[PDB]
From Swiss-Prot:
Localization, UniProt: Cell membrane; Mitochondrion inner membrane; Nucleus; Cytoplasm, Cytoskeleton
Function: Non-receptor protein tyrosine kinase which is activated following engagement of many different classes of cellular receptors including immune response receptors, integrins and other adhesion receptors, receptor protein tyrosine kinases, G protein-coupled receptors as well as cytokine receptors. Participates in signaling pathways that control a diverse spectrum of biological activities including gene transcription, immune response, cell adhesion, cell cycle progression, apoptosis, migration, and transformation.
Part of the full-length chain shown: 145 to 250 of 536
Illness the protein is tied to: SRC kinase activity has been shown to be increased in several tumor tissues and tumor cell lines such as colon carcinoma cells. Thrombocytopenia 6: A form of thrombocytopenia, a hematologic disorder defined by a decrease in the number of platelets in circulating blood, resulting in the potential for increased bleeding and decreased ability for clotting. THC6 is an autosomal dominant form. Affected individuals may also have bone abnormalities and an increased risk for myelofibrosis.
Additional detail: May be involved in blister formation in Pemphigus vulgaris, phosphorylated-SRC is abundant at blister sites but not in normally adherent tissue, which corresponds with loss and disruption of CDH1 in cells adjacent to blisters. Phosphorylated SRC is increasingly abundant at pre-lesional sites of blister formation and occurs prior to changes in abundance of CDH1 and DSG3.
Domain text: The SH2 and SH3 domains are important for the intramolecular and intermolecular interactions that regulate catalytic activity, localization, and substrate recruitment.
SUBUNIT field: Part of a complex comprised of PTPRA, BCAR1, BCAR3 (via SH2 domain) and SRC; the formation of the complex is dependent on integrin mediated-tyrosine phosphorylation of PTPRA. Interacts with DDEF1/ASAP1; via the SH3 domain. Interacts with CCPG1. Identified in a complex containing FGFR4, NCAM1, CDH2, PLCG1, FRS2, SRC, SHC1, GAP43 and CTTN. Interacts with ERBB2, STAT1 and PNN. Interacts with DDR1, DDR2 and DAB2. Interacts with CDCP1, TGFB1I1 and TOM1L2. Interacts with the cytoplasmic domain of MUC1, phosphorylates it and increases binding of MUC1 with beta-catenin.
Protein name, UniProt field: Proto-oncogene tyrosine-protein kinase Src
PTM: The phosphorylated form is termed pp60c-src.
Top-rank taxon, per record: Eukaryota
Family to which the UniProt record says this protein belongs: Belongs to the protein kinase superfamily. Tyr protein kinase family. SRC subfamily.
Length: 106
């Protein structure tokens, strides 16, 4: 279950996810997963970043879930669960702004 996951923030807006992630103490890759504001059944992976050009900023990645069963950001790379997806992206940056590091503070 995802609702039991400490990184699952459920139904919070994009503005609120940014409010939480834009904390100067959050290092690159701080993250949270929330419901997709407009795609039913889909999720959103909001991640903090930091670079000299943009300074502290947030990126949001849409996570889709098929009825076939897999979860994915890109259809090319699928997982059986949201937890598995999160674990994979905590080890690989791939197309993300940074690998997932730790759960965003409240
Ligand atoms: C308006 C906004 O914030 N849109 C987001 C997507 C988003 C998606 C859904 C929802 P919700 O409605 O449905 O929730 C919200 P929101 O409004 O709630 O905030 C916000 C976005 O466009 N992010 C970018 C993030 C990285 C840059 C590229 N990109 C396309 C892309 C390119 C490469 C990869 C990639 C990643 C990993 C591996 C390989 C490639 C992924 C995406 C994005 O989508």
């Amino acid at each position: 279950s995802i609702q039991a996951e400490e990184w699952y923030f459920g139904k919070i807006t994009r503005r609120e996810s940014e409010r939480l992630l834009l904390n100067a103490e959050n290092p690159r890759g701080t993250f949270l997963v929330r419901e997709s504001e407009t795609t039913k059944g889909a999720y959103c992976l909001s991640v903090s970043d930091f670079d000299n050009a943009k300074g502290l900023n947030v990126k949001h990645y849409k996570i889709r879930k098929l009825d076939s069963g897999g979860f994915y950001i890109t259809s090319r790379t699928q997982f059986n669960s949201l937890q598995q997806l999160v674990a994979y992206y905590s080890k690989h940056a791939d197309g993300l702004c940074h690998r997932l590091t730790t759960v965003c503070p409240t």
